Enzyme design. Structure first.
Site, PDB file in Angstrom:
ATOM      1  N   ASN A  72      66.115  36.975  62.667  1.00 20.08           N
ATOM      2  CA  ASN A  72      65.838  35.591  62.381  1.00 20.08           C
ATOM      3  C   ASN A  72      65.750  34.775  63.671  1.00 20.08           C
ATOM      4  O   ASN A  72      65.266  35.275  64.704  1.00 20.08           O
ATOM      5  CB  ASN A  72      66.846  35.075  61.313  1.00 20.08           C
ATOM      6  N   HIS A 176      64.296  43.201  56.847  1.00 16.14           N
ATOM      7  CA  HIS A 176      63.488  42.220  56.103  1.00 16.14           C
ATOM      8  C   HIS A 176      62.929  42.834  54.835  1.00 16.14           C
ATOM      9  O   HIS A 176      61.843  42.510  54.368  1.00 16.14           O
ATOM     10  CB  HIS A 176      62.419  41.591  57.025  1.00 16.14           C
ATOM     11  N   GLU A 282      67.817  40.078  52.499  1.00 13.98           N
ATOM     12  CA  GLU A 282      67.899  40.572  53.885  1.00 13.98           C
ATOM     13  C   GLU A 282      69.360  40.561  54.380  1.00 13.98           C
ATOM     14  O   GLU A 282      69.923  39.484  54.628  1.00 13.98           O
ATOM     15  CB  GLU A 282      66.996  39.710  54.821  1.00 13.98           C
TER      16      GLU A 282
END
Ligand SMILES: OC[C@H]1O[C@H](O[C@H]2O[C@H](CO)[C@@H](O)[C@H](O)[C@H]2O)[C@H](O)[C@@H](O)[C@@H]1O
EC number: 5.1.3.3
Length: 322
Positions: A72, A176, A282
């Site tokens: 992220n 992901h 995730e």
């Protein structure tokens, strides 16, 4: 009984492996992405697969099981660690962030395979010291090795992170993982009571807030009309019990149980506009922008590897028919 079989997947070399219950395909050149996972007893594909090679490279974090090292966003691609300042590429321009790390679009090597009555193992690896542009951003000898094992009805998916260099470095990892998720007829659950307050750049303010619908979330709930791009805190740290997301497909009666160990302290859930027919639950070992938060590590999940140390972070996807 189990098997390994070299294949070509959309023109790129890949490895199919499995047993009588499950079959995966991993694509080493595509950031070691597990691009396909099939439940053999029902014949159902579980993961979002790309239509073409080009559509994959357009959005390589939105198919299969992309590896996010680190996961992220990092504000301005910038942070400090033990006095030293780091600048990662700003690849998310509108929100001015580095996003999703170094590994989802790089070629990994297949280091070994192993088959016994305990299951089929495929191992891939990448050494960041061999990536000159990565070294410009993050001058550390990190090595990441994935160990995939299919045994009975479970894909085990273990990441071993190694410091082979002269200095300590901070690290986090996430996936992901993009499951097929028909909004009309599938259910979702998650072991989380709280979530991280985010600003307009999808960066944590530092504050936690109760999840108002947490009872529904624990139990299993539809996602019709709900649009998610949320950083949930795993309830395990505070309450114990399980650390897992569950997807239930109501037609074929398939439960997908995505477990993660105590290192996976956060879960980001993303379903775009809710009309794209997928869901990404995730698991992350660290919270978005963890490197830039003055909060305890028990909370953020930030980890550090001293020279010569290694850490294995475990997660697994179990398929059940009920
Ligand atoms: O990127 C370096 C800066 O990181 C922190 O600030 C960013 O991250 C915060 C927590 O997510 C955000 O609130 C803030 O808006 C971002 O700018 C740190 O607090 C700054 O001092 C660093 O320069």
């Amino acid at each position: 009984a189990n098997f390994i079989e070299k294949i070509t997947y959309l023109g790129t070399p890949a490895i199919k492996a499995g047993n009588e219950h499950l079959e995966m395909i991993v694509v080493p050149e595509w950031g070691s992405n597990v691009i396909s996972l099939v439940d053999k007893t029902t014949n159902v594909q579980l993961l979002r697969e790309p239509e073409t090679a080009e559509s994959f490279h357009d959005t390589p974090t939105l198919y299969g099981i992309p590896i996010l090292f680190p996961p992220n966003r990092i504000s301005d691609g910038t942070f400090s660690f033990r006095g030293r300042t780091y600048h990662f590429d700003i690849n998310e321009k509108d929100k001015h962030n580095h996003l999703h790390g170094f590994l989802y679009h790089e070629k990994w090597n297949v280091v070994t395979t192993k088959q016994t009555d305990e299951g089929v193992i495929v191992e891939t690896e990448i050494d960041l010291s061999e990536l000159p542009h990565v070294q410009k951003q993050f001058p550390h000898h990190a090595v990441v090795r994935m160990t995939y094992t299919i045994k009975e009805n479970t894909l085990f998916k273990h990441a071993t992170v190694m410091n082979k260099g002269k200095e300590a470095f901070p690290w986090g990892i996430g996936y992901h993982t993009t499951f097929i998720f028909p909004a009309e007829s599938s259910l979702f659950s998650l072991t989380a009571d709280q979530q991280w307050e985010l600003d307009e750049r999808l960066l944590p303010t530092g504050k936690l807030m109760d999840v108002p619908y947490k009872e529904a979330l624990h139990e299993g709930m539809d996602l019709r009309h709900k649009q998610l791009d949320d950083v949930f805190l795993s309830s395990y740290q505070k309450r114990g019990g399980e650390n897992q997301a569950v997807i239930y497909h109501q037609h074929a009666h398939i439960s997908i149980i995505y477990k993660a160990d105590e290192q996976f302290k956060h879960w980001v859930v993303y379903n775009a506009d809710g009309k794209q027919g997928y869901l990404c639950p995730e698991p992350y070992t660290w919270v978005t922008n963890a490197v830039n938060l003055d909060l305890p590590s028990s909370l953020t999940g930030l980890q550090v590897l001293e020279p010569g140390e290694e850490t294995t972070a475990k997660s697994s996807i179990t398929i059940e028919l009920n």
